[PDB]
Amino acid sequence: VVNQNAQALNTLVKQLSSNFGAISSVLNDILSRLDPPEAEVQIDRLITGR
Amino acid sequence: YRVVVLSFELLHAPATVCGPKKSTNLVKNKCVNFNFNGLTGTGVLTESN
Amino acid sequence: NCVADYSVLYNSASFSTFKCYGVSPTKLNDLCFTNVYADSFVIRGDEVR
């Protein structure tokens, strides 16, 4: 039971490091690079996978 | 048409080239928005061992 | 290892065709990079596209 919850929590955190097709996983990088209308395209991909 | 293509390397090494952005004093033991070498984020700054 | 100010080029109109695919033109100064390579050359008019 302890290991089961540990794997579920660990897996859930490791997904944040995945790009999900986006240029980068960090949101501050997208905001600091792409234009406002262009950032929405990348941010949508991260929200979709997350 | 004179063409010049701008290429760059991102987050593979510290930034030696940065525009005229005036630096400020450092704050500690408080939650603040910090930008260091182009790295943006919010967090409490404390001395690490 | 220098200070790159890209606002002077954006404020004063010079470049006829200026487009940034990788990053935003306004964020060039906000976010800064380590190595910057500039390939300079000249091409025929219709070859810029």
Swiss-Prot record, chain A:
Residues 1-43 form a coiled coil. Changing Q4H: In strain: Omicron/BA.1, Omicron/BA.2, Omicron/BA.2.12.1, Omicron/BA.2.75, Omicron/BA.4, Omicron/BA.5, Omicron/BQ.1.1, Omicron/XBB.1.5, Omicron/EG.5.1. Subunit of the fusion protein that is processed upon entry into the host cell. Mediates fusion of the virion and cellular membranes by functioning as a class I viral fusion protein. Contains a viral fusion peptide that is unmasked after S2 cleavage. This cleavage can occur at the cell membrane by host TMPRSS2 or during endocytosis by host CSTL. In either case, this triggers an extensive and irreversible conformational change that leads to fusion of the viral envelope with the cellular cytoplasmic membrane, releasing viral genomic RNA into the host cell cytoplasm. This is Spike protein S2'.
